[PDB]
Structure formats: C-alpha cells, structure tokens
A = this chain, B = another copy of it.
C-alpha cells in the first residue's frame, strides 16, 4: 500500500480521537475514543492491503512524512510494518490487537431526530473562540424558530445558565424542544462543512456530524433534555 497526503491528513486527525488505530484491508478506516465518546469513519482513496494494529498512530504518521510519497508500506517478514523508500527502509511495530481500542462494527445511525448543517468557518470560530472564552460545553437547542449553538463554561456556571457564545445554524421547522448538550472535549472533527444529524431516545443521545471526508458520532451529555 501507499498512503496519499489526504489519507495521512485524515489519519492524523483520527489520532486525536484515539492514540492508536486498527486498520483493516479495504477502503474504510475507523476509530473510537477509548472512552467511547467520539467515533470517526471515512472512506479513503487508497487501498489498505493488510490488517495491522498501530499503537502510536501519531508517531507512525510522523515517520511517514519523512519518506517520499511513493514509499511502499507492506507487511514485514516478521510481521511488523515495513515502510520501503527508494534508498531507505524503516520498520515500525505492529501492535497486539488486544491492546488497541477499536470500535466493534460501524452501527448504522438511527434516522435523525433533527437535521441541520454547520458551515466550515462557523465550526472553526466555535472551536477557536472556545479556547479563549473557556467554553467547555455547548448546547444545540431551539430559539426563536432557529437552531442555535450556545457555549457555556461549566466550571464557573454549573447549570449552564450564562451563555458566553451563540451561533445560528438555521431555522427550525418542527415544534419540539430539545436541549442537546455536547462536551467540547469531544468535538474532534477535522475542519470542514458538516450535515449535522441529531438523535435521541429518552436518556440516550448522539450527534453525527457528516462531512465530505468523514463522519463523527459524539455523545450528548446526560443532562441533555428533550421532547422526542
């Protein structure tokens, strides 16, 4: 196999969700935070030709970027990973699958409870502002006929009473109130535009951001409330 600069771009991102990864032969990669709070999946243009577990995925990717693009990754004679360059050969360790957290299967996402979209530069402002205002939790909710995101600093405000930031995604057609709370720490998506599919059944909840490059499902906190 060979990995394009786009695939490694993607992979570096997944690495932020979980430090390792389990790659399986095919055109599909996926990962999930160890704590199961954020899941990512993507189809890639390159074909992965062997099953391998990588323990430090960030390390692996760093190494890759030190070789040419044509560098041919293959299974090592003894089983580890072999990155073979024009004049050089690197060897990276395959990991015992039992030590790397992987999602079981890609569970289909339930048909959406609510649907909206978020623009690439709005998602960026939200993330960026978030560090500055110290917004550690956000709430996708309904106000005045529109879907908005409201940021709160949960350490200084327990109830999510004082709203430090608000962003307006689009108008809302339905009659349902939903206050969907998300933990900033779990918004790991790479910057871009996303269809946003919200879903809830009772105390259960999840939000799936669906991008051009990949998808991300991320848990809504226990304090999320709704009419669904």
Contacts and interface: CB of A to CB of B under 8 A. Distances in A.
Interface of A: 59, 62-63, 66-67, 87-92, 122, 125, 128-129, 132-133, 162-168
Nearest to A149: B88
B132 A164 contact: no
A163 to B, nearest CB: 6
A40 B13 CA distance: 42
A73 to B, nearest CB: 15
27 contacts: A59-B133, A62-B132, A63-B129, A63-B132, A63-B133, A66-B129, A66-B132, A67-B125, A87-B122, A88-B122, A88-B165, A88-B166, A88-B167, A88-B168, A89-B165, A89-B166, A89-B167, A90-B129, A90-B133, A90-B164, A90-B165, A91-B162, A91-B164, A91-B165, A91-B166, A92-B133, A92-B164
Nearest to A58: B132
A1 B122 CA distance: 23
Given A62-B132, A129-B66, A168 B92 contact: no
A165 B89 CA distance: 6
Nearest to A85: B125
A166 B163 CA distance: 54
Interface of A is mostly: mixed
Contacts of A91: 133, 162-166
Nearest to A78: B162
Contact of A128 (B66, B125, B132, B164): B66
Nearest to A148: B89
B166 A125 contact: no
Among A59, A88, A168, chain B packs the most CB atoms within 10 A around the CB of A88
Contacts of A164: 90-92
Nearest to A134: B59
Contacts of A88: 122, 125, 165-168
Nearest to A169: B87
A72 to B, nearest CB: 15
Pairs A-B, 8 closest by C-beta atoms:
A89-B166, A63-B132, A62-B132, A91-B164, A88-B167, A66-B128, A90-B165, A66-B129
A169 to B, nearest CB: 9
